[PDB]
Amino acid sequence: PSLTDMSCEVPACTHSSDFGGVAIIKYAASKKGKCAVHSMTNAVTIREA
Amino acid sequence: KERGASLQHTAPFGCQIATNPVRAMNCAVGNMPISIDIPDAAFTRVVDA
To answer: Could you tell me where this protein is found in the cell (chain A) (predicted)?
Structure first.
């Protein structure tokens, strides 16, 4: 899948050691399939690989 | 005979009165702290709403 028109929204965040924040990414993608996710800022860790 | 009016009829702040046992009821006087401890199971998440 190739992705475009992406927007990232953060319903709530708490700095709680336990994945205390949750984010919704709206996107348009060219085809169906599995796709990797990563965080480019060292101060934020995402649970989903 | 010379009795006068009971507290049921004369009392301030709109309160009712009864005698077995004696109570002043429903006085519209001052304000009341109320405090709730709510179990975490009761709230629905900002992503679920």
So the answer is: Host Golgi apparatus, Host trans-Golgi network; Host cell membrane; Host cytoplasm; Host endoplasmic reticulum
Asked if residues A12 and B46 have their Cβ atoms less than 8 Å apart, the reply is: yes
Residue with tokens 């702040």: B13
d(CA A26, CA A6): 6
Closest CA to A13 of B40, B48, B47, B41: B47
- What approach was used to elucidate this structure? cryo-EM
For residue B41, give how far its alpha carbon lies from the nearest alpha carbon of chain A (Å): 17
- B48: which chain A residues are within 8 Å (Cβ-Cβ)? none
SS3 category, B8: helix
